[PDB]
Symmetry: C3
Subunit: 248 residues, 3 copies
């Protein structure tokens, strides 16, 4: 567990991507290597897999001597990170001691000591699955549709055809459909190998999208009764990925 | 019995319906060729509400033949609150017993709202002998009602020829909102004799919760008579409250 | 008659009274022709607060009959929260036992707040041998107190000739805020001797709750001494807290 120093410009933007991931997760193992920071976890019900990738190119300074793994209480991490201001510089530093030093540099120098915990790691690999539909979408539309569907039901069907993407949610007598075609502003791209249908639980979806920005481009991949994969990019180089089990 | 009605500015339509559902829970809407109208009482039969939306405020108005539909206002309000300010609102009825509500913007979102049947009654808006008229900025009205609620549960309106006064007394504390024609908040005053009435703040607070701070409100009342309160939607729509006086 | 006092900016006056009410329940206001003065302690006798409003911040200041009034700070503060940022505020004492609070803007709004009888202590604002003075913006002071609250119940203030640091330590966690005159948050540092003290965060939280992020705050303290913080209102008025140290 050798010392490292990592610096990110924009503490608030870092906080907000940690808050997205923390919504499903309570404890995470961060793998720190020469090439960047990666984190891979499952939510307690083992229905969602989260995969974060922060390559070293998004850090203004990145000094890692040898690769190591640190365990972190995501709630306590998140409460500290929330104190960051939008033009603060964030510094994550470890010494010989077994705690993370989190510093905000801006109008003043604020440093928190975060204690490192032991997180037993599951055998987790991001499998490359045969998705038959891919959709790129304005976060606003996606956040919209999940909220709308929650008025009606607990589950949300995704339907991809060659020229339209539909989310549909039916209650006992109420019903909502959101429909997108490439003529529409919210939809940036749509590729379908064959017409695809699946359904996912809104509670999980709501938690996945709660931190996503209204203007960010979100990529969905799914298949008939397959997991749903959702991803967006951080500073164009980082990636956050969710893999969500279908409702069967 | 099909119709199709289009409104530019979905969130504005929501705010208008939200004003009405503050007191109402179920309503019959009469859809005629000349526009949409609605008339209902709150559950305690103290307040009557009248909503008139003429054809001219809709960007497209297609009505095959007059019809009445009954709506759960709360369900209507929950759906209508998901429209965005730049969305186009479409109210369409096919041949079945659902209202089809559509928001057109960055996406097409379509809800199906089931219709209900509503006990409609001998509900007419009579022209009572009002002796005072007041036009004032919604801001002044909304603040005078919040001011008075910290002091009492009733608000006394007092019109004389040169001053409009709203006054509220508790056991200890007092508040008086005074308006003369020299004040920015009073746009018009016409008083044919000294008029004095009192109304309950709980009802008043619900009537004005949804009124905008720069909307222009018209008040008509008479001594121990109902208070009539009007403001205009897009200059041609009209919402009217008629409120029973308190003893 | 006995006095008329006018302040332009009713919301700004409200915020000032709101900062003091965070720790006080009642207070005696002394209205002389030099200005209005107020000196109170919190219920636990740990914080002394001193407010001084010179007549030069009031747009009209007529005190016929010097007096001292007694005010329920929470009643006062819920009345003053009704003022708008563009209202003029008028405080009028007539012959009777009430304070007349008027907001003049869009309309004329008048409240009658009943005066009360406050058991006034004799409170000195003593001169103290402070070894350290710090001037910093509200934003950094307000953030250090919030950061320290995630860790502990008290924070240590530590001043050296070059550095001001606030440090809070829990069972396991730790927060350290450090300022040097290189940093935009610290506008002045004067340190006679290396000075160390600690204070309760709950009191500091309530002290800064009302301070604005742009406000400039002065801290004086000495080793194991009270902490004095003050900020200025319209350059001439002054609000001072004195906070007992922690053991």
């Amino acid at each position: 567990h050798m010392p490292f120093e990592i610096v990110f410009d924009g503490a608030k933007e870092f906080a907000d991507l940690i808050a997205t991931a923390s919504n499903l997760i309570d404890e995470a193992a961060f793998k720190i290597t020469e090439e960047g920071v990666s984190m891979r976890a499952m939510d307690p019900s083992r229905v969602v897999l989260i995969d974060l990738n922060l390559p070293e190119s998004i850090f203004s300074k990145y000094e890692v001597e040898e690769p190591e793994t640190i365990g972190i209480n995501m709630d306590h991490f998140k409460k500290i990170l929330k104190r960051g201001k939008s033009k603060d510089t964030l510094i994550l530093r470890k010494g010989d001691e077994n705690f993370l030093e989190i510093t905000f540099e801006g109008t003043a120098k604020r440093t928190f000591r975060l204690p490192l915990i032991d997180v037993e790691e599951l055998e987790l690999e991001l499998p490359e699955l045969p998705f038959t539909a891919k959709v790129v979408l304005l976060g606003e539309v996606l956040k919209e549709a999940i909220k709308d569907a929650s008025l009606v039901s607990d589950s949300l069907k995704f339907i991809a055809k060659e020229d339209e993407f539909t989310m549909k949610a039916e209650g006992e007598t109420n019903e909502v459909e959101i429909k997108l075609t490439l003529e529409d502003e919210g939809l940036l791209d749509l590729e379908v190998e064959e017409e695809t249908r699946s359904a996912y639980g809104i509670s999980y979806l709501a938690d996945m999208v709660k931190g996503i920005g209204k203007a960010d481009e979100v990529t969905l991949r799914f298949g008939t009764e397959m997991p749903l994969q959702m991803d967006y990019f951080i500073r164009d180089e980082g990636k956050l990925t969710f893999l969500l089990a279908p409702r069967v």
